[PDB]
Amino acid sequence: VAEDIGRQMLAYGRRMPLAEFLKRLEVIDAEEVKRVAWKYLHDAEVAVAGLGPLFGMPQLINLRRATFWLRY
Amino acid sequence: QTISPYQLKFIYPFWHTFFARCWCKCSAYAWPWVWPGLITFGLVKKMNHDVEEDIRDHYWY
Numbered sequence: 630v631a632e633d634i635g636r637q638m639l640a641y642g643r644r645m646p647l648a649e650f651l652k653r654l655e656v657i658d659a660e661e662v663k664r665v666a667w668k669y670l671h672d673a674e675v676a677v678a679g680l681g682p683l684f685g686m687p688q689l690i691n692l693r694r695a696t697f698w699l700r701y
Numbered sequence: 702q703t704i705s706p707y708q709l710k711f712i713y714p715f716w717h718t719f720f721a722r723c724w725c726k727c728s729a730y731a732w733p734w735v736w737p738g739l740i741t742f743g744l745v746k747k748m749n750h751d752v753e754e755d756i757r758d759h760y761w762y
């Protein structure tokens with residue numbers, strides 16, 4: 630609880646009550662998820678880090694073009 | 702380390718290194734290709750010069 634108080638006072642300038650968070654979370658449906666992902670995640674840049682036996686790792690460009698579909 | 706192609710200049714690097722790449726390629730090909738070609742060209746001329754003279758030594762009066 631103390632970590633939640635302090636972290637929120639620095640980030641938001643206040644503590645959000647539990648009821649407010651639950652009210653904001655309640656009105657998010659599938660059409661709002663689609664809107665936000667289309668704006669920020671669709672056809673976007675990616676960064677990658679890796680370690681170990683990586684002979685079969687995809688190309689960066691393969692990962693970059695997997696952020697969109699050609700169907701639809 | 703690799704950078705995304707959407708965040709690179711991709712035509713300027715070709716011309717930035719043009720003179721070095723052209724020197725390497727043209728220097729490699731000079732002796733092996735050009736020197737036999739000049740000899741073949743010369744033989745083509747000598748051949749055509751002897752054909753003409755041989756026609757006049759047999760048909761012209």
Ligand SMILES: CCCCCCCCCCCCCCCCCC(=O)OC[C@H](COP(=O)([O-])OCC(O)COP(=O)([O-])OC[C@@H](COC(=O)CCCCCCCCCCCCCCCCC)OC(=O)CCCCCCCCCCCCCCCCC)OC(=O)CCCCCCCCCCCCCCCCC
Pocket residue numbers: 694695696697698699700701
């Ligand atoms: C009289 C003359 C008349 C001639 C007319 C003939 C027709 C000409 C067609 C011209 C088409 C030009 C456009 C080419 C684009 C191809 C599609 C594409 O974008 O691929 C992306 C596809 C996936 O992209 P990605 O970046 O990996 O992923 C991005 C997303 O994350 C991935 O997101 P996702 O998961 O949503 O996407 C999955 C992906 C699915 O991905 C896969 O799993 C692989 C898809 C297959 C490869 C792409 C199709 C082209 C393959 C060429 C086959 C030609 C056979 C020739 C036989 C001739 C026999 C005479 O979805 C699809 O693309 C589904 C296919 C779409 C529906 C079909 C329309 C495209 C077909 C194009 C023509 C092929 C059929 C012609 C048959 C001819 C028979 C006579 O790329 C690849 O698979 C990579 C290699 C692609 C090579 C393309 C070669 C194109 C050549 C087409 C000409 C056909 C030759 C006809 C000869 C006729 C002689 C008589």
Ligand SMILES: CCCCCCCCCCCCCCCCCC(=O)OC[C@H](COP(=O)([O-])OCC(O)COP(=O)([O-])OC[C@@H](COC(=O)CCCCCCCCCCCCCCCCC)OC(=O)CCCCCCCCCCCCCCCCC)OC(=O)CCCCCCCCCCCCCCCCC
Pocket residue numbers: 709710711712713714716717
């Ligand atoms: C002889 C035929 C062959 C063609 C002609 C000869 C070949 C050269 C022509 C000139 C093209 C190159 C111009 C300089 C480089 C431009 C790019 C660049 O980075 O420059 C700034 C760069 C420095 O800038 P920076 O600040 O570091 O970076 C800025 C960029 O952000 C750096 O970002 P980036 O590196 O990522 O790239 C930037 C990007 C962004 O560039 C842009 O600014 C975007 C431009 C958008 C348009 C793209 C061009 C589309 C044109 C299509 C045709 C017109 C269609 C419209 C309708 C027409 C209706 C009639 O650049 C491009 O996309 C280049 C677009 C131009 C492509 C070449 C088009 C040539 C043909 C045009 C006519 C069409 C063909 C004829 C058919 C039609 C008529 C019958 O400087 C250089 O790259 C060094 C320049 C020195 C190189 C030029 C050497 C020329 C002499 C050698 C050739 C001599 C003749 C052939 C000898 C061999 C055979 C005997």
